[PDB]
Amino acid sequence: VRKLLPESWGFLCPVHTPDGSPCGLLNHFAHKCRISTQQSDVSRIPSILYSLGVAPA
Amino acid sequence: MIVPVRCFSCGKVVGDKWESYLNLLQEDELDEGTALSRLGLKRYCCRRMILTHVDLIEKFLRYNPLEKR
Amino acid sequence: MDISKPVGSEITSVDFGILTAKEIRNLSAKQITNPTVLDNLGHPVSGGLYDLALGAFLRNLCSTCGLDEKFCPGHQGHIELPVPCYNPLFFNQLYIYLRASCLFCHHFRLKSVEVHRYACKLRLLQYGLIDESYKLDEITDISSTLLNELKSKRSEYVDMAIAKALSDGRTTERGSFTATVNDERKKLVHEFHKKLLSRGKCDNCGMFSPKFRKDGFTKIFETALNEKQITNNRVKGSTYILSTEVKNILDTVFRKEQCVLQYVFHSRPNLSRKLVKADSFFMDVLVVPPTRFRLPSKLGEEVHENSQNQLLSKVLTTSLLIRDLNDDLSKLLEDRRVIFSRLMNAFVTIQNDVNAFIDSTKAQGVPIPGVKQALEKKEGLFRKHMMGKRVNYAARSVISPDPNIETNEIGVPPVFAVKLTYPEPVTAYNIAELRQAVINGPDKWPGATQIQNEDGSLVSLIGMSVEQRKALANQLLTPSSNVSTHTLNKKVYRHIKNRDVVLMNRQPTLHKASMMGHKVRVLPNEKTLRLHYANTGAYNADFDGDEMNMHFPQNENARAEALNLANTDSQYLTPTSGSPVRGLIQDHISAGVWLTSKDSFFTREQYQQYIYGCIRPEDGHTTRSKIVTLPPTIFKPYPLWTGKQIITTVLLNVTPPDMPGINLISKNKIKNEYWGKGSLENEVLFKDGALLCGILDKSQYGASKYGIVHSLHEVYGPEVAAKVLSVLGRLFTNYITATAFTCGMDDLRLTAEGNKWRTDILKTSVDTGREAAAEVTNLDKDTPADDPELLKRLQEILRDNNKSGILDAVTSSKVNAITSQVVSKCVPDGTMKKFPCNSMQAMALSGAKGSNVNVSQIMCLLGQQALEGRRVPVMVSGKTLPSFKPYETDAMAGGYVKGRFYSGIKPQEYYFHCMAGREGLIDTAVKTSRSGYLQRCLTKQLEGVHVSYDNSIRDADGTLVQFMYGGDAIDITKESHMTQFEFCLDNYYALLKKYNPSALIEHLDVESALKYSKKTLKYRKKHSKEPHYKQSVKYDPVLAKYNPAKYLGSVSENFQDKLESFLDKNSKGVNEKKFRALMQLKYMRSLINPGEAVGIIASQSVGEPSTQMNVTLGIPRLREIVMTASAAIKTPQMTLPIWNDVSDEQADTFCKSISKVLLSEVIDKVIVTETTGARSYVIHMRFFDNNEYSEEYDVSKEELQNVISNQFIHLLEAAIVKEIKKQKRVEANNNMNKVQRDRQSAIISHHRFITKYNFDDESGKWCEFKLELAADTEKLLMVNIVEEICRKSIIRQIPHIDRCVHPEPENGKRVLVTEGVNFQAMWDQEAFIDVDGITSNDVAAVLKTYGVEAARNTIVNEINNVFSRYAISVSFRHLDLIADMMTRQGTYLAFNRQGMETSTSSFMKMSYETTCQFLTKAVLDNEREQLDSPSARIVVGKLNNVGTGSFDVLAKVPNA
Amino acid sequence: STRGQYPGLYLFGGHSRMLRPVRYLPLDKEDIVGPFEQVYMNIAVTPQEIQNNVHTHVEFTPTNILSILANLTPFSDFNQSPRNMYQCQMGKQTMGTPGVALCHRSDNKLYRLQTGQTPIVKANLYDDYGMDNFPNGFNAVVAVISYTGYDMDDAMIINKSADERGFGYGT
Amino acid sequence: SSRHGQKGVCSRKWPTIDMPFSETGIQPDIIINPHAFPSRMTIGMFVESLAGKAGALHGIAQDSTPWIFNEDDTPADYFGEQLAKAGYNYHGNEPMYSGATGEELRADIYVGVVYYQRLRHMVNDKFQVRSTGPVNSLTMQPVKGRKRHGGIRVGEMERDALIGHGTSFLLQ
RNA sequence: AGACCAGGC
DNA sequence: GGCAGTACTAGTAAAGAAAGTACTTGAC
DNA sequence: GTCAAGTACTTACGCCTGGTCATTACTAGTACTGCC
């Protein structure tokens, strides 16, 4: 869990992480990693997936 | 916070050159290297005082508890 | 402590007994009775917990002694528990004797002659008669007349054997209790209690007793007798029971069997002849502690009562409810049942309160801690306030580095010089300087803060003016007006001067050189400690914010130990390897390269300035009272000196005269090729104290063996080598402040040719990641990266963890051979600025600071970023990173970064280098905590082992570990130049002065040990061609017969066989016999002194190098060997010596016959076929071709048929029946021949539900067999069954051996390593394996088949090569004692709480862990201990028996 | 894929996601992607490393992967990586300037350096977060030299007449 | 501390007349050891010295956001030519004298203006002393704590070091 | 005197 | 003028992702 | 008598400096006030 996995490219900072006991666990975001804080407009996406070729469930 | 009197590495008096520096960048449109050379700051220890001074006292002075606001 | 207040009485021993109820009614000050602690208006109520009879409480006099708060010691009180309750320390043993005993005749349920068999074997183990207890057992439904004749002769044998052994000088009437008779007594009582608990009927009168039940604590139940065997209790002509009745049973059982239980509860003979009683296991009276020890905490108004007062109130609350429940019974069914069902509930709650007061984990109802849990762990009492303590007279501050300090001194601040103080008693030789100190005052160094009068009184100087303070200066040396205090004098607590001693200390104190005794020198300016640079590697101290402790010793016995014994000049060599830890570090090593160069020429003013800047005769560094110089190197045109000639006269002034100069031929770290062509500056040369050739380096001064400071330590002494490190530390500091040293950006550049060499090699790395991928994937060569077969198998590699390891080890093996081509070519040959001017190379080659791999990553390329063995991890998609496409075969894409720190690394190179950097910061964190508990388990066992005056190392209680330390009794810190015979011959006349042969003959026996050393040397050259089992030796070595510390020439046999091998070869006014007479004197003075804390040193020499850290390896291997002593070893092996007759082809077809073959390893696929509606199955297991597995596994076609016939189906028939039980909650014909129809018929007959069977008899490819079931059964999977059976069925297996590998021949010999231990089965293979050379890894299996001394030899080599893998040299004297301590009982014992139970010291076992488990085992044994162990002499405050306290001091008084 | 992650098309539009801007190469504009989304696509770190028909996106800058403190250590691709990791721990333990409303604060312990400076050597993100409002250090004439003997292992010295003039002074 | 991981306490406030001085007349206000660089490999502090000094001569701020330099255009080539246009050298070295002896030193000294940081770990928050003081109530041992004039602890790992030297009166 | 949190080496 | 309702008061009672041995209950 | 997994009690670097928040419900009582 303390390792620097490559999936954190652009989301967690590779270098800004403390030493010793919090090493690897406490870590900081990248400065452009925004976090979504509102549920987005979703309700028109199944109407425009059925036109692209999706058989309905 | 406020401009350092008597720069740290040699001892040249530097604190009388802040308001002359902002004059020679705003009215007389000089770059920062010509203005430090016109004020007599030749050694690069003397140059990095006026060049890199933040003048943070102008941000402190807006909190005056001795006056209505 | 006050040295002017003696003490005549001493505690000799302690012994753990049970505190009876009759004593603590006479012991008690006042019985306390109500559960109110303190009433209103802040007073303590009389009769409660806070009481004035229990001690003075809160500004109020005591009611027992009448003293105030400062002088009342506190007094014992008690409560009266109304019913006898269960003591939770003894309930696990009370429940043993409550069981296993008859309730009718009140013996045990054993026969009375076998209870007597343990009554008199334990009597023989109280005395020192470990061997007579087994002769007693050799004495032999049955009438009860000969049993009295049997009990008579066994009792007469004991009374004769005790009488004989006590008469024949062996055993005291107090008995003998060693360690190995504690083993035989613990083995005998555990066997006795185990046999008591397993009895059906009472063997004295034959009828049953109802079995008791304990679900949890606080309660006991007995069960009703069965409905069948009530008949036995009619032919002799569930229930909760009370603790008064449990006591009523065992007050009868312990009386009917008094003659036996006296020996179970006594380790030593009971000279008091007290009865053992059942009141021991119960407690009818709680003892409340003194009220001093339960004062309440206070934080402003937030005052809370103590936890023990909360627990003792709830006992008193129940102790009054249980009396108020006796109101109705005193007055007297419905009026009787509700008052009795509420009384019985008070019995349980008063038990649950007396448990929770003693043990918090035996409570129920985050809980309030009891009295057990104030003792147990770290933050207990043995470990937080006994073995470690807070101390007075001690400072701690940040350290700052400091030259101009004489390498044995510390620099103390002024504000530490004011506060810390020392008691000087005034004498006739103090009132000059100690009158001046008391005039100066508390705030003027050197001053004084207090005067202690003769009466014990103490006058402070703080609030005093100077006129009042000069009058007390005339009061010091006055005759006392009191006759009772006429021999006492005043003590002036003066400040710390420059002559005092100081004990410095930096955590973690991993070894004893991390806590040294420094001298003092006060400094005027700032508030920090000042440490010289030769001490910075012994404490492991850097100066980025280290703070370290300063303990100031308070008497002359301690000042004489941190100046002579714990001194920092005595700690030059560490006892781990014998290598120095002290030396100059970074700037001084970079300056001796420039000073001792050929270019350094100094004029007459420069040459004489550097000498007085370092010698300074008035401080006492010279030895001539005048600085002597040399003639210059050059006389014309003007005189010039050399930096060789600087250190020649630096060493000429600090050396003692009339003793010749040093002679040394050594080498250094810088090669000859860095100084040009024909250079000789690699070899250093000292001839009569004159440096004639060679640079001076880390190898000469610095922590490194056989340099010039290490050689000055040997020939001249430790006081010289500590002075040379001061003078050279000032010679190089003064050389640096006039001729400095810089590293810049100029030092990091390559040439335009070297950058061309760099990029042309790295263009060959663009195809390296593809060649390594094409090799592992088993394509041939030259396949493109976008090949769909290359990308298919690389996806197959990623999904497996082992296939990805052999891809990350082939690419890393190829790209690190491209890294090794740039470092070999571009440095130093392609660098712009070169040595000596290249300061980046100049301090990496000289060992000042840096490595060759550090200048590689700076100037050439940074390399492969290796993770924990592997390369950079890959995502699920086959991408190593979002920048790189999936599964590309690039070296850069997998962690090999080509950019260097000079010109930068790319953002994907930066992210790979951050993965490897975080790996180092976790291994620096998580792997410095695992070695800390290795050393704690080691030091607790080995705290008391030490050299005796017999030169025979042994434990504190007296049991003997070894007969001689290392076999030769020579100290590791004194045996460095012992076999450096070419060094000691060149320095003969100067080493003869320090050993002084002529003045050291009278107290010796020169004549006798030399003769018997020739009787054995002539015998061993004549014999000893035969191996060791034939050698009836007829002669011991001179160490086993003669004392080597007294008899000259009593040396070891390697020292004799290497001196007679040296002195035979070369023939060089010293003759042959005066050199062998001075090495035997050098040997005898290099003996180890008696009293050395060897096992601490032996356990610090393993725990401290452990922080530097297809088989298990490292600190997990040391836990398997040392700490756990596991017989369930993780990866056992066995090394098999191949004969010279069998070749490499006869050896690897041999390892195919030992390594196991599973049935799973031979099967291609298994196709079941189920048709239901009798559930049918067609199990068709398809193999590989017969030419494929008879070559690979050497399995024949017919042997594979026998595994299916006799082994596979008998495991398959079981797995089908096991599941039906647990669910109740193309090919040939059928008329083939007569034998296959009867081969089928035998399979059907001997198995349960087979109806058909046929093997491929002509080709060995398939095996099909029908397998019917009943129609009642539901569905089984029958593929997950078959796969699990096919992995457990074995074709061929030697038991406990799973693989046999033929590795490459390491170090000449031919080696065959297995992966499992079976020594019996490898003895049958004499024709292939040398059976008398089979070494192994399983230390517990070599003990079972080859014995104790073979396991002792095995454990030394296995604890050796865990340090030899990391190139860590720890000597075979520390590994010898850990071996002989772990096998000291003939078994393989661990360094843990299970392996230390056989030990005499009770406080040692109680201090380590499980404190109140060793506490109960001591008080049950009534165990007296002699206070021998170092952990037992700190609990009771005794001087140790190790080192300085290993003897007494007597004073010769002239008059009678 | 053969034995990989379970396939499917997963759309996410809810709260608490992790999101970073990235530049999308057909019709060059901004795209916002997530960690579950990024593991199967091919972004490039600079537009001089785009390979044809494999790269869908590029980053706007390689320095949008580092944090606030991580972008402000200068020339960070020349340092060994633990010494960049040590700086992010030690860049936020300095005696700097906490604020300018200290007359209206009542915090129990506060560290204020008197005359801070802006560096000659700074990132372009320095003047973008307004770290000139909070100067956490000072420019110092640093000579890399073994001259003194008092600064060998890890230590350092100051000119004595420098902090007679206020060099590194704080309350 | 610098902005690169190069921490370290102050050893002495070395006086101006004892410090090295250049030919331009300046004196450094920080001395750092060159032996802190090879094992640590912080070349961002070397190139901050060229970038800081060449910006102090011209009155300009050079940016240092990472990966603005390739392997083709090394910043040591970039900031060296800025120092060479001002009169200083391409490598960032200056000819300095000694303060004690006054002689010309051997090589030119690597100088420059880098940005230091003052950490909050002063001595005054550390640095405890005790001769005697308050004790605990039930052990009569000194109190844990610097600000209560309390003592330091000699634990188990320091107890056996006093055993291991064989000094039995230091342990008592 | 504990809990949790932030550090130091 | 004194009665009873509330709102308070101070009063005393309840509060989930590691290693090893050792004991022992399970069936047979 | 016994194997046998199952259940139970144990440790898990050193010491060093800071800061914080650390009893709650309720229950019966004396007093305050609105009222007739």
Ligand SMILES: Nc1nc2c(ncn2[C@@H]2O[C@H](COP(=O)(O)CP(=O)(O)OP(=O)(O)O)[C@@H](O)[C@H]2O)c(=O)[nH]1
């Ligand atoms: N017992 C412990 N010792 C520590 C701890 N942290 C630091 N130290 C000691 O302080 C020293 C710090 O060394 P570092 O961790 O910084 C390893 P580093 O690569 O920075 O060495 P240098 O590069 O030579 O400075 C080290 O010798 C340790 O003995 C710790 O958590 N526990």
Ligand SMILES: [Mg+2]
């Ligand atoms: Mg350090």
Ligand SMILES: [Zn+2]
């Ligand atoms: Zn200046």
Ligand SMILES: [Zn+2]
């Ligand atoms: Zn008393």
Ligand SMILES: [Zn+2]
């Ligand atoms: Zn009986």
